[PDB]
Amino acid sequence: SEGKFQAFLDVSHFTPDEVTVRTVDNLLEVSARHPQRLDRHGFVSREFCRTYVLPADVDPWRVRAALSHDGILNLEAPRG
Amino acid sequence: XXXXXXXXXXXXXXXXXXXXXXXXXXXXXXXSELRLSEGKFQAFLDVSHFTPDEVTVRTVDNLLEVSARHPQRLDRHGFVSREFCRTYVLPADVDPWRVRAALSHDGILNLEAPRGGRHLDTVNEVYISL
Amino acid sequence: MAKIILRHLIEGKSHFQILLDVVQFLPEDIIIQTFEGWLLIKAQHGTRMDEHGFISRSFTRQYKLPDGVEIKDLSAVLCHDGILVVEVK
């Protein structure tokens, strides 16, 4: 855990195509916004924007972003 | 195609039945695919696999049911049997009766029905009991 | 400041092969059963939402064996891309 501050967010609800992040200043954002999914019970629309407060020790640059086939998007940033 | 949908084209061998959908949007008031505009409710389907006698269309209330089902034939790979019962949801404005349908030589049913039969109203909002 | 981007994610003789095009027919719906020798499969997609209009299907196809073939050496596979192949390896 020490050295690199990583945040784990389950993006399983959303598609890998409709995925947005964007750094902007010290804070690190994450935007999704789906269209109406087919589903089993009926049509469903979902939109979520979670802003992760990155520390002053961690850079804006070299911020790695990867999502597993299970739907676990890990936003990591080395400090220093 | 790959996990991130990065494709690398391939055919070579034979294939089976079915098709892929056409251009359509959501969040409307009404609900190859539909092309229903303001006044004329039209549709289209790839019924190329089926013979004209095999195709049966009926408007059970407000739903234009397009039934198919064709027994085993020669095709190319072997004895193949198909079946499909695609139903369309017409708005309250469109008449359940007075629905036209045309099968092309290519094998495409081009359904049509005009809007103007009912007033078509409603919103209503319920309260939580807790 | 600048936006960050996400990443991740990765015949002739002695053999008989039959690759078919399983569209939106799920593996829970598709069933590949082999009798005496003829390779059979049925799609059968239930009455789903299907975006525009609610649709349903059924695609049962039987493929004849080339005489010298045993319904045990054949091992089928439904690839993620959509193409389901029944071949002997």
Author numbering:
A (entry chain D): 70 to 149
B (entry chain A): 20 to 50, 65 to 155, 157 to 164
C (entry chain Q): 1 to 10, 66 to 144
Copy text verbatim from the article accompanying this structure deposition.
sHsps are found in all forms of life and typically are dynamic oligomers that have ATP-independent roles in cellular protein homeostasis, protecting the proteome from uncontrolled aggregation especially during environmental stress. Here we have investigated HspB2 and HspB3, which co-assemble into a tetramer with a 3:1 ratio of constituent subunits. This protomer forms the building block for higher oligomer assemblies, consisting of 8–24 chains.
The resulting monodisperse hetero-tetramer was crystallized and solved at a resolution of 3.9 Å, allowing the roles of both the N- and C-terminal regions to be discerned. Reciprocal exchange of the C-terminal VYI motifs into partner β4/β8 pockets of HspB2 chains A and C forms the hetero-tetramer which is bisected by an approximate dyad, that does not intersect the AP dimer dyads. The symmetry is unusual, reflecting the unique stoichiometry of 3:1 for the HspB2:HspB3 chains. Whereas chains A and C form the β2-strand of their respective ACDs, chains D and Q do not, leaving their β3-strand unmasked along the sides of the groove, while increasing the space in the shared grooves. The map has been interpreted as having 3-KIILR7 from HspB3 (chain Q) filling the pockets of chain D. A 3:1 ratio would then be the minimal size for a stable oligomer.
